[PDB]
């Protein structure tokens, strides 16, 4: 990162996962932007730090920046069981980590507020961000989804998500939310949870690109299909939000936008003033 940036790397114990979770962190205010990674999340650095100047862009913004590290194919959710076939030796509990363990550690050690924050996700974690806002409104009054999979329980989505998770580290969607008919699928479906976002008055920022090249993952899915379905589902989400009385959203579907880190970063920059005004202001 740019010289002079007070960027830290932390080891935050997760009791629920029985291991330490690495977290990249920049201070600068009591409230924070949680920057969530995609399907191919690595164990060294969060994709936002690898691919974008996020820390530099939010330096001296009055907001802290939190980039959890790890959780390949996790959907930032609490799984039913260890991923069956790839030999995972514990159960992912990333919702517990993000909503309890991590904010408790950051509050106790640094004074970061557990409440009044923003969740910003892309691709895999676009839906995660909205789900976090749906069920933890005090923690996340603001959520952004950038090229997110916003109707994971519908139609071919469980199949596509299963394919993409397998293509990213051999993870099993069935171990995560059960068979596609299990209640966990709808529970974690932003489209289904729109009325929670409306009643919570969540400030939502929803971007979606189209075409190629793509950083969505799921490269094992026939060319162009995931990229187009992601757009169509985002458009349906947009229409449904309005139909359900939603009145606190920004929807950015620029025709030249792609599902790629450069556009996701452009959106992160574009929403900065928006987050500042909503969270601080
Ligand atoms: O996400 C934050 C959670 O953990 C914090 O430690 C609690 O103080 C509370 O603010 C919340 O239950």
Atom of ligand 1 at shortest distance to CA of 98?
1
- The CA 262 to ligand 1 mean position distance, Å, reads 33
Atom 10 of ligand 1: nearest residue by CA position: 114
Q: How far apart are CA 174 and CA 84, in angstroms?
A: 9
Contacts within 8 Å (CB) and 24+ apart, 12-20: 12/101, 12/102, 12/105, 12/106, 13/101, 13/105, 14/93, 14/96, 14/97, 14/101, 15/101, 16/93, 16/96, 16/97, 16/101, 17/90, 17/91, 17/92, 17/93, 17/97, 18/90, 19/90
H or E segment to which residue 196 belongs: helix 194-199
The β-bridge partners of 66 are: 25, 34
Q: Give Cα separations from 90 to 16, 46, 69, 241, 274 (angstroms).
A: 9, 21, 17, 37, 38
Q: How far apart are CA 214 and CA 201, in angstroms?
A: 32
Domain range annotation of the chain: 1-281
In terms of phi and psi (left: phi > 0; alpha: psi -120 to 50; beta: otherwise), the region of 154 is beta
Helix axes 261-270 and 272-279, enclosed angle (nearest 10) = 40
Q: Structure tokens of 248?
A: 């606190």
Atom 5 of ligand 1: nearest residue by CA position: 104
The domain made up of 1-281 is a member of CATH 3.40.50.1820: yes
- The CA 141 to ligand 1 mean position distance, Å, reads 14
Atom 12 of ligand 1: nearest residue by CA position: 100
Answer for the pair 48, 67: CB distance below 8 angstroms, yes or no.
yes
- The CA 11 to ligand 1 mean position distance, Å, reads 18
Q: Which residue has the tokens 């069935």?
A: 174
Q: Give Cα separations from 46 to 37, 49, 54, 231 (angstroms).
A: 6, 6, 11, 25
- The CA 100 to ligand 1 mean position distance, Å, reads 6
The technique is X-ray
Of 92, 71, 99, which Cα lies nearest the Cα of 107? 99
Atom of ligand 1 at shortest distance to CA of 139?
1
For residue 66, the SS3 value is strand
- The CA 209 to ligand 1 mean position distance, Å, reads 34
Burial 63-87 (b: 16+ CB within 10 A, else e): bbbbbbbbbbbbbbbbbeeebeeee
Atom 3 of ligand 1: nearest residue by CA position: 100
Handedness of CA 280, 111, 200, 74 (dihedral sign): positive
Cis check for the bond before 213: say yes or no (omega within 30 of 0).
yes
Q: Structure tokens of 166?
A: 């397998």
Ligand 1, CB cutoff 6 Å, lining residues: 99-100, 103-104, 107, 114-115, 139
Atom 9 of ligand 1: nearest residue by CA position: 114
């Amino acid at each position: 990162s740019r010289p002079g940036l007070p960027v830290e790397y932390l080891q935050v114990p997760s009791a629920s996962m029985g291991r330490d979770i690495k977290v990249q962190f920049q201070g600068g205010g009591p409230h924070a932007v949680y920057l969530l990674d995609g399907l191919r999340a690595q164990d060294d650095y969060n994709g936002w730090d690898i691919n974008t100047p996020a820390f530099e862009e939010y330096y001296q913004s009055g907001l802290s920046v939190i980039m959890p590290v790890g959780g390949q194919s996790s959907f930032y959710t609490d799984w039913y069981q260890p991923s069956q076939s790839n030999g995972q030796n514990y159960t992912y509990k990333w919702e517990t980590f993000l909503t309890r363990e991590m904010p408790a550690w950051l509050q106790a050690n640094k004074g970061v507020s557990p409440t009044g924050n923003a969740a910003v996700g892309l691709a895999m974690s676009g839906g995660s961000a909205l789900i976090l806002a749906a069920y933890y409104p005090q923690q996340f009054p603001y959520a952004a989804s950038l090229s997110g999979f916003l109707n994971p329980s519908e139609g071919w989505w469980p199949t596509l998500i299963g394919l993409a998770m397998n293509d990213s580290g051999g993870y099993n969607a069935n171990s995560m939310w059960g068979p596609s008919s299990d209640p966990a699928w709808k529970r974690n479906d932003p489209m289904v949870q729109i009325p929670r976002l409306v009643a919570n008055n969540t400030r939502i920022w929803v971007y979606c690109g189209n075409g190629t090249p793509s950083d969505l993952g799921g490269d094992n899915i026939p060319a162009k299909f995931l990229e187009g379905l992601t757009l169509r589902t985002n458009q349906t989400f947009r229409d449904t939000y309005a139909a359900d009385g939603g009145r606190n959203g920004v929807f950015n579907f620029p025709p030249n936008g792609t599902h790629s880190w450069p556009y996701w970063n452009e959106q992160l920059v574009a929403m900065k003033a928006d987050i500042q005004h909503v969270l601080n202001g």
